[PDB]
Write a protein that binds this DNA or RNA. Sequence first.
RNA 1: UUGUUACGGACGGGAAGAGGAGACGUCGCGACCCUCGCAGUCGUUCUUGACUGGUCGCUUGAUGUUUCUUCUUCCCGUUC
Lengths: 72, 164, 122, 69, 84, 75, 78, 79, 93, 78
Amino acid sequence: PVNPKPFLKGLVNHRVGVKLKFNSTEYRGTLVSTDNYFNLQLNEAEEFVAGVSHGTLGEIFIRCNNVLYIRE
Amino acid sequence: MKFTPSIVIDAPQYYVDHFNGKYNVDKCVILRDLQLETDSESMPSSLKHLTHILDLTNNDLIMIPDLSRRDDIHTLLLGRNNIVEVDGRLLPMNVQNLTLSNNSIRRFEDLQRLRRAPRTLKNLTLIGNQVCHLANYREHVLRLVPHLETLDFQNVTAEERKSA
Amino acid sequence: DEDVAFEYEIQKTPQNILTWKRYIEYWKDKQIRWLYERFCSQFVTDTSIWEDYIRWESETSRIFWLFQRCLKSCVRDCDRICLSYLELAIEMIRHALASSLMKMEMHRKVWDPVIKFVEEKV
Amino acid sequence: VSTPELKKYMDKKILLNINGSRKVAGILRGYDIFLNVVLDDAMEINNHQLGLQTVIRGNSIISLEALDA
Amino acid sequence: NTLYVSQLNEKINMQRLRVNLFLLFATFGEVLKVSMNFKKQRGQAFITMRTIDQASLAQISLNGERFFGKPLKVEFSKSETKTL
Amino acid sequence: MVPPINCIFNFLQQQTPVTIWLFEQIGIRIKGKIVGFDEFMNVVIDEAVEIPVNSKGTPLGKILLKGDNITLITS
Amino acid sequence: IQVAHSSRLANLIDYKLRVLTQDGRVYIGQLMAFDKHMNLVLNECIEERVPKIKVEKRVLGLTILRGEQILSTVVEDK
Amino acid sequence: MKLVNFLKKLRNEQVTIELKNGTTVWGTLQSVSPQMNAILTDVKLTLPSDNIASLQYINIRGNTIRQIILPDSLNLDSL
Amino acid sequence: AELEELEEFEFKHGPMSLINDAMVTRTPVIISLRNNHKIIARVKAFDRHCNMVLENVKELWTEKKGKNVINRERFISKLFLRGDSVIVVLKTP
Amino acid sequence: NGIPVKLLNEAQGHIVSLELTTGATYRGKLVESEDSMNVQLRDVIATEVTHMDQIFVRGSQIKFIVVPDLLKNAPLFK
RNA sequence: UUGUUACGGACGGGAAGAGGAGACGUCGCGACCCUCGCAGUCGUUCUUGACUGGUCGCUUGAUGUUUCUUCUUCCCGUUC
């Protein structure tokens, strides 16, 4: 019943968790909007390098190709 | 005439020597029977174009002159020349296949430029000269030029090396 | 110096005049300009070599001097050099237009631009 | 657009060699233009079983030797 | 044009042999043939040249010349080469 | 014969157990149940647990795995 | 090295070009054909390895090169 | 629409580009394509600080070029 | 025309919106890369596939063997950074 | 259409060597060729050494495909 | 047709003494071997279809993956 793009849509204005393959760093923030090619935009972004944070970034944007997954 | 830049430019660099590499240059109207009496001047006009196979045979070249990088003239053919001495620091690693047949290399001491070959000349052959007729010449060559694999078509064996 | 080498090699043989181009494009520059001027003075009095000398010249005084140089010894490409001198003097357009009629007197459309300029001037 | 000729390899066991030093093996059931090979077996390498049928992505299938010629 | 060699050292390798041949024949004229066609070794090699004169010269001069121990038996080819 | 477009549909219908494999790290492999339907290989999967398999429980919710990053699917 | 001021891939057909690959292995070969992805058909391939100092050599192929892993081709000699 | 268009409009100007190997290579752009297939006339190379090991001509493929520099200090795209 | 023309406003709604905004009102942004890199610059142009053009480009990377961290720096300006290398961009206050 | 593809198609029933991203050099017969460069082989050797009966290869990850010296000028070009 | 745009101190090599090594392949220097010639082998029929330097040393030949863990003496070149 629940498809991917609709799930993604639902998850707008809510917390999102995303990770990368190259330089494994967990990005944590609240989602803003998405497009057909699955690029991302977050607010209140915290760059957790394997648990420990580098710094509170704020309003950020992420490309699709690097992203591993979307979680809570 | 003398080996100028214009002559080099003129030279037929179309038919590549298909045995190895590309661009088998023949300086002047024809390097075979060019009649370059002086040393090979204006080598910079070629500018390391190409084994290269710069066949400068049937000339009157007094001394062997080179001016290029480590991969610029591996299969150089200087047959039927008047090569007295071929000392130089430019062509160190490149010139492996040296066709120096029918040269004017008289003494064994004339090959002292090629001798002490561990650093002086990375590879060199030399054959068909007046120095080949001298007593214990091959042995001497073996002693000095260890890099010389093929000595006048026949190889430098282990036994030979031991002897020298 | 390679200038003496180029001059001796060019002097020992008239050898498909691009040897003067080898003396030119090596420095190309004032030495190349003087060498190409001596080349155009010595043997080659063609339109392409004079045009290359004018291209080496290419501020209105030098262009007018090159146009006076290309006015001398020009037979085949006369109307094209005439239109080129008209465009050069268009920036003494009337005197050089009469000089264009002198060098090349076929010349209807080129004279029509001077007539259009004379109409726009009024 | 053009279909890969995998009808020859139908009903034949295949020893695959996917990217990243992993030797998977299984019999071919279905195929497609993207090369997402629908195969009905999976035994990893020594040997041990981990689930029956396995559908694999097209990008991560490099080499595939047929067992039965 | 072509010159069929015979009676040479079979112990030497193919490419190397070819190279040697090339080196030898560059003094007379421009050697057209880059590699051997027969691939049998033991003397049988066809040295293809651009000019006939050059070939003739080669035949004259290198008849029974010491190349890798044995004397090479030079001779003119029966049929013309595929390249020529 | 089972084509991969209908495969997705079947998965959606059934909701079978799954063990998804990743590209970069060989050890860490995801486990859950596929739900969604899509033209691309990108599909949503509930109850995701990342297990370190030999050559033991990463906290993770209902995952949506990227279309280029799936190495294996099972049913 | 001699090479004239060429404009496009069509004008430089049938020339001995070097080719560089993603891993860093050097090639040489005469460019025979053209394609959308620059799958340049080499006339004779002499592949070369450099370990991660000095360049090695091989002589296996006379190949149809694929355009995915190519970095940048270089002209050797006409 | 696209910024390959921008690249296309540039002609006869030096630009450094850092490749996947990692070399600063200044060269003239020549006929730029929609696939970013650049061609450089004069260039400076470092085979795997930047060691000097330069060649004259080279034909670049578009997938490698990540950054470009020094066409000319000016921004214009739409026409 | 309309199939491509309707995609023009897709930047300002979706995930590129922030970058568009940045471009409009030039401000510094932190750009990351693949093989350990950190670039800082202000935005000027923008397109569909993240092939951006910037100004005042400060680079920070490492070319240190044997696990020693060395932060080298050099001023670059008016680049053309292709989208395949760009991972994360963000508008700072 | 692609000339290399055409060439490949033409060379059906010929001994063609290969090389992948990892560098596993094969050598055997060519079975079939398509628009996407998908190759299948028979009696195929493998020197990464083993001797394999058959193999199918994905087109995207191939580095280069070897062809013999026969199909050089004719009958593909003009 | 062709193009463009738009949609004395350092370093290197070789040798010796004291406390780099093993696999997988890929090309070479010797040969007691094979093989014998100018453009190879076999099927079938009076002229056509298919398939293509090998083996053994190296008595210290070259070279890419993949695991583990330097000092002294002499000789030859470059630099100050």
